[PDB]
Amino acid sequence: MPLFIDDALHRSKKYFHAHLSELLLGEFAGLSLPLHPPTAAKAAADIDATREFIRQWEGRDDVEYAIRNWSPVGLGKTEVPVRLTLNTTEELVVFAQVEDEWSSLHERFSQLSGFTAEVVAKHVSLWRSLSNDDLSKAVLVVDWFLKHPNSGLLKRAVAVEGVHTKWLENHRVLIETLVADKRGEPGRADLGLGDAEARVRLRFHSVDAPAGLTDIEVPLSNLCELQEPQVILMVENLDSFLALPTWPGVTIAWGAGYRAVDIVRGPYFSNGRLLYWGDLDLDGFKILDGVRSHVPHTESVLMNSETVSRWRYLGVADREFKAESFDNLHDFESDALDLLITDGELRIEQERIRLDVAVEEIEKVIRG
Amino acid sequence: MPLFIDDALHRSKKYFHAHLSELLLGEFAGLSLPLHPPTAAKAAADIDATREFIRQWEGRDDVEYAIRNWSPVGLGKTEVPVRLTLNTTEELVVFAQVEDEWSSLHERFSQLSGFTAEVVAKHVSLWRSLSNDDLSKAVLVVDWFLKHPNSGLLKRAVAVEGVHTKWLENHRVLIETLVADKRGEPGRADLGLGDAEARVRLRFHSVDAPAGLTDIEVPLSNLCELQEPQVILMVENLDSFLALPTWPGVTIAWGAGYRAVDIVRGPYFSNGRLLYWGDLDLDGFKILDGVRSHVPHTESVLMNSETVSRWRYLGVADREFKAESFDNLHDFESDALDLLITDGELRIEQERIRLDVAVEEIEKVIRG
């Protein structure tokens, strides 16, 4: 089919957008589009559209013309445009009508001349839409990450002017690439940003309270400053954790559900006898399994078929129950979870156990 | 209009439900419903419906009948039912067809005979739908609240079997009424339940860290176990609070927004020089005002027209701005809030201040 000038314009702009990387590198191979001039029969079938096709190309210096003999259809020998060829990037950009976009791209590109041009061009998609101020901030941030490698600092501790956390996160992939470039690392550099926040809550009896503080929440990293505990009681439910009294030599730990598995990776938790009390449901047993995966001498409390049998009348159906296998449960815990399964996937929350009964069973287990 | 038997049944049941309190008290005044027998003309216009009306009442001992003379319409003297009268609660309940509901209501009511019958009947709406087990638990809970007045304990510390927090809350108004009854208090008793709310977060320099713990979160009640601070830096935004370094003799406190006003009620906060750093918006200044309402020597940091003037280019419009007057701001803070107002209700979040600049201004203010 005949390629009209509007169609060539569209294809040229589409190609320009498809090869933005190469053009910024000066790697323009040229674009050649055949215009497919009408056959004699088509020229005779629609004389006016064929005239329009030819007229749209007349007088262009980048267009090849050829004489076709249409004498059999009464038009005689007529010169028709056959092919557009754009050899230079300037010809493409002026033809594709993208001069302002190209100038803005080169201006932004030139602001990035401190980095490898090849890498910049390959990821043009990351920066073509940024403001010049955003680019200047980006350069400043890259220098900051090069001067403070593995800072371990929170995203907020990047003290670069105009750089707030939401902005730094939004362009993060670009920053990682540019840090990799300056470091000579492939792809994306580790920024060495931190997250901190590894926290755990502990309660003490007044005789053991560090500096007399009987209820503290600390980062896991500070646990080495404490006296080693003889007994740790980890409690999943917070309300049960808070209602318990405190005992000499016993550190009470809040398990915070599944967070228990990450918490027990701290050496503090292996230095004592670890007792765990969770929910009587799938999730409590899965947390117990994960805890023993790091501290195998973990003893369960109130997570036995005897307690289940007593308190199942307050159980509700666990709505999310999916049979999962746990490798680190003892037989009596497999028996208790199976017992919860068969009564209709029961969940017996810790809060349904009478606090005094839980205290009595805990005291029995702790005393040995 | 003639009242058919179905309509009387409906009205009797509706009345029964409307006076449930009085019936349980034996205060049944009787129900009298006039049946409005047809006039001669209506009896003649619809002979069959009139026959049905009469037939539905025939043979009932509680129905008054009267002879109407319908001879002018060819029916002669005909006896017609004129009025239903139910004098006893049994007649009403059997007629209203609510025997099972009435028996269940009295059984539940008899379970409440330990309390004033009048009060129980007046609030029948609170208990008619409970199970007998829920009633037994309620009695046990009432005895618990009578034996532990002003316990200050959390809802979870109610160690009554089968009573969990969600259940105790769902029936709470009923429990308060019953405790009031046994206490001889009008209406609803204070249960004397607590909320054990507090929680302030503190960071220390390593030389001041209690037992070497440099980042702790404690209940406000534990603050008396700490050494009195020389300087407190309260920070509203958490990310700024965490990114700051720690200084000798300086305790950094997390203000947690509006929670700062309740936190500073602790004597710990008056024992030192209290510095506050909040957001540059309406909320930060309102928190500062509330803080000084308890600790008048509170000094603001970075909440001045100089800092505003420098960082306003990162401000955004505060969308919830409502002109509020604050009594405890100093003139330079009124000037800074007014400056935020006039540039279009700006919010300049703490995270937009360069961390090193905030550190420098904080260090200047702390050093004096």
Residue numbers in the entry:
A (entry chain B), B (entry chain A): 21 to 388
Show the paper's wording.
In strong agreement with these findings, we have previously shown that in the Gram-positive bacterium Corynebacterium glutamicum the MksBEFG system (a Wadjet type I system) is indeed involved in plasmid copy number control. Unlike the classical condensin systems the Mks system from C. glutamicum contains a fourth subunit, MksG (cg3103). Our data reveal that MksG is a novel, divalent cation-dependent nuclease that effectively cleaves DNA in vitro in an ATP independent manner. Our data reveal that the plasmid defense mechanism by MksBEFG is executed by the MksG nuclease activity.
To get insights into the function of MksG we determined its structure by combining low resolution X-ray data at 4.6 Å resolution with high confidence Alphafold2 (AF2) models. MksG is formed by two domains, an N-terminal (N-ter) elongated domain formed of mostly α-helices as well as an elongated 3 stranded β-sheet, and a C-terminal (C-ter) domain with a central β-sheet, flanked by α-helices. The C-ter domain forms a dimer in the crystal by extending the central β-sheet. The N- and C-terminal domains are connected by a flexible hinge region. A structural homology search using DALI on the AF2 database revealed that the C-ter domain is homologous to the topoisomerase VI (Topo VIA) domain of the Rec12/Spo-11 meiotic recombination factor. Structural comparison of MksG with Topo VIA shows that the TOPRIM domain dimerizes, in the same way in both proteins, to form a DNA binding groove and allow for double-stranded DNA breaks. Sequence alignments and the structural superposition with the Topo VIA subunit of Methanocaldococcus jannaschii show a conserved position for the magnesium binding residues essential for activity. The N-terminal domain of MksG is positioned in a similar manner to the 5Y-CAP domain in Topo VIA with respect to the TOPRIM domain, but there is no tyrosine candidate in the equivalent 5Y-CAP domain that could have a catalytic role. The only tyrosine within reasonable distance for a putative catalytic role is Tyr258, located within the TOPRIM domain. A modelled DNA molecule could be placed into the putative binding cleft formed by the MksG dimer and the distance between the two active sites could be compatible with double stranded DNA breaks.
